[PDB]
Design a protein around this ligand. Sequence first.
Ligand SMILES: *[C@@H]1O[C@H](CO)[C@@H](O[C@@H]2O[C@H](CO)[C@@H](O)[C@H](O)[C@H]2NC(C)=O)[C@H](O)[C@H]1NC(C)=O
Ligand SMILES: *[C@@H]1O[C@H](CO)[C@@H](O[C@@H]2O[C@H](CO)[C@@H](O)[C@H](O)[C@H]2NC(C)=O)[C@H](O)[C@H]1NC(C)=O
Ligand SMILES: *[C@@H]1O[C@H](CO)[C@@H](O[C@@H]2O[C@H](CO)[C@@H](O)[C@H](O)[C@H]2NC(C)=O)[C@H](O)[C@H]1NC(C)=O
Ligand SMILES: *[C@@H]1O[C@H](CO)[C@@H](O[C@@H]2O[C@H](CO)[C@@H](O)[C@H](O)[C@H]2NC(C)=O)[C@H](O)[C@H]1NC(C)=O
Ligand SMILES: *[C@@H]1O[C@H](CO)[C@@H](O[C@@H]2O[C@H](CO)[C@@H](O)[C@H](O)[C@H]2NC(C)=O)[C@H](O)[C@H]1NC(C)=O
Ligand SMILES: *[C@@H]1O[C@H](CO)[C@@H](O)[C@H](O)[C@H]1NC(C)=O
Lengths: 170, 106, 50
Amino acid sequence: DSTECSNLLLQYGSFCTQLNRALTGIAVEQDKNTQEVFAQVKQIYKTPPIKDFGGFNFSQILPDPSKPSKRSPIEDLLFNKVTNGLTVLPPLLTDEMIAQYTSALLAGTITSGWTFGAGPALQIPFPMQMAYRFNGIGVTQNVLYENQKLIANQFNSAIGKIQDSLSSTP
Amino acid sequence: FCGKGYHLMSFPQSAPHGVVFLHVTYVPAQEKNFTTAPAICHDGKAHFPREGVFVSNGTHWFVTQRNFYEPQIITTDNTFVSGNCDVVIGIVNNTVYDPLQPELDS
Amino acid sequence: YTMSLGAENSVAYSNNSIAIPTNFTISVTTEILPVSMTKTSVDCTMYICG
Ligand SMILES: *[C@@H]1O[C@H](CO)[C@@H](O[C@@H]2O[C@H](CO)[C@@H](O)[C@H](O)[C@H]2NC(C)=O)[C@H](O)[C@H]1NC(C)=O
Ligand SMILES: *[C@@H]1O[C@H](CO)[C@@H](O[C@@H]2O[C@H](CO)[C@@H](O)[C@H](O)[C@H]2NC(C)=O)[C@H](O)[C@H]1NC(C)=O
Ligand SMILES: *[C@@H]1O[C@H](CO)[C@@H](O[C@@H]2O[C@H](CO)[C@@H](O)[C@H](O)[C@H]2NC(C)=O)[C@H](O)[C@H]1NC(C)=O
Ligand SMILES: *[C@@H]1O[C@H](CO)[C@@H](O[C@@H]2O[C@H](CO)[C@@H](O)[C@H](O)[C@H]2NC(C)=O)[C@H](O)[C@H]1NC(C)=O
Ligand SMILES: *[C@@H]1O[C@H](CO)[C@@H](O[C@@H]2O[C@H](CO)[C@@H](O)[C@H](O)[C@H]2NC(C)=O)[C@H](O)[C@H]1NC(C)=O
Ligand SMILES: *[C@@H]1O[C@H](CO)[C@@H](O)[C@H](O)[C@H]1NC(C)=O
C-alpha cells in the first residue's frame, strides 16, 4: 500500500503488465489443457441400469451412486491420496464435471466400443467388443468366446489388484 | 490424430507462419439396430465370422462387415469352425449354407 | 449459469443387440498448426546505447 514505492515502480515501465500477462496465459493454458484432455466427447453417455456385461465387472471404475461426489471407488481413492498479492483462480471445470466426463468416456467405451470416438455411438455387446479387440491384436474370436469366463475373472482380479496396489503404496 | 472419424487421407495447405491440414475422414451414419450373436451353431459345430459380424433383421441371419451394413448369406467361405456349440455362451441355431452342396446335388 | 457438458445420450445397451451403419459421410475438417515465427534479431549495443 506504499504510494512512494508505486511511484518509484512506475519508473520501471510495464514489467508488472508482462508478469500479469504471462501468469494469465499460464492460467488459461491450464483450463485449455483440461479441456483438451477430458472434453473429447460432446455426448454424455450413461451405462444401462442392469450391469450385465457377460461377467465383466466395472464397479471399481463406474461412478458410485452412494457417494455424493458421484466418483468411482478408484477415483475416490485417488482424491483421498492427494493432499501479498497472491490469488488462486478456481479451475473452469470442477472435479464433479471432470468425473462426469470420465464417466461418459467409460460408458461410451463399455457400451459402444470405439465407435463413439469416430462418430455416433453404436451399441455392441461387451463380449463382442472384447472379441474385436482380440482380433485387433491378432488373436481369433473363438479364443475369446471359449475362454470368456476366465478372461472376465482375470480382468476382475486385475482391477481389484489395481485398487489394492493404489491403496497400499504411498 | 488426423481428424475426427475414421481417417482416409489428408491435404496440406500453406498458411502464413503455419500449415492447415484438411483431414478427409469417413464418418458412419444412418445406423440400424440388429439382433446379434457371437457364433452360429450348425451340425454340432460353432461357426465364427472371418472378418464380419452375425446380424439378424428379426427372422433371418446374415453376416456383414462391421463398419457398413451389407448382409450376405452365412456360408463356409466367410466363417470358420472352432469347437462345438457347448462352450460359447449365447450361440444361436441357424443353418450354414455350403456352396459345394448344389454341385454334388446336381 | 452452470455449464452443460454435453447433450444427454443414453446408449441402448443390451447383451444381444448391435448397431450397424447403413450409410456414411465424407467429412473434411481443418487443423491449423503454427510452424515458425518471425525471425527477429536485436543489436544489443544499439538497443541499449545507440
Ligand atoms: C462386482 O464387483 C463388486 C466389487 O468388487 C462386487 O461387490 C461386492 O459384493 C460382495 C457380495 O455381495 C460384497 O461382500 C462386497 O462387499 C462387495 N464389494 C463392494 C466394494 O461393494 C459385486 O458383487 C460384483 N458383481 C456385480 C454383478 O456387481
Ligand atoms: C430379413 O431379410 C430377409 C432377406 O432380405 C427377408 O426375407 C425376404 O422377405 C421378402 C418379403 O416377404 C420375400 O419376398 C423374400 O423372398 C425373402 N427372402 C428370403 C431369402 O427369404 C426377411 O423377410 C427379412 N425380415 C424382416 C423382419 O425384415
Ligand atoms: C439348438 O440345437 C441344439 C441341438 O439340437 C438344441 O439342443 C437340444 O435341446 C433339447 C432340449 O433341451 C435336448 O433335448 C437335446 O438333447 C439337445 N441336443 C443337443 C445335441 O444338445 C438346442 O436346444 C437348440 N436351441 C434352440 C434355442 O433351439
Ligand atoms: C435401437 O433400439 C433401442 C431400444 O428400443 C432404441 O433406443 C430407444 O430410443 C428412443 C428414441 O429416443 C428412446 O426414447 C428410448 O428411451 C431408447 N431406449 C433405450 C433403452 O435407451 C434405439 O434408438 C434403436 N436404434 C435405432 C438406430 O433405431
Ligand atoms: C446415404 O446418404 C446420402 C447422403 O449423403 C443419400 O443421398 C441422398 O439421397 C436423397 C434421396 O434420394 C437425395 O434426395 C439426395 O440428393 C442425396 N444426396 C446426395 C449428396 O447424393 C443416400 O441416398 C443415402 N443412402 C441410403 C441407402 O440411405
Ligand atoms: C441376455 O440376457 C438374458 C436375460 O436378460 C438371457 O436370457 C440371454 O440368454 C442373454 N443372452 C446372451 C447372449 O448372453
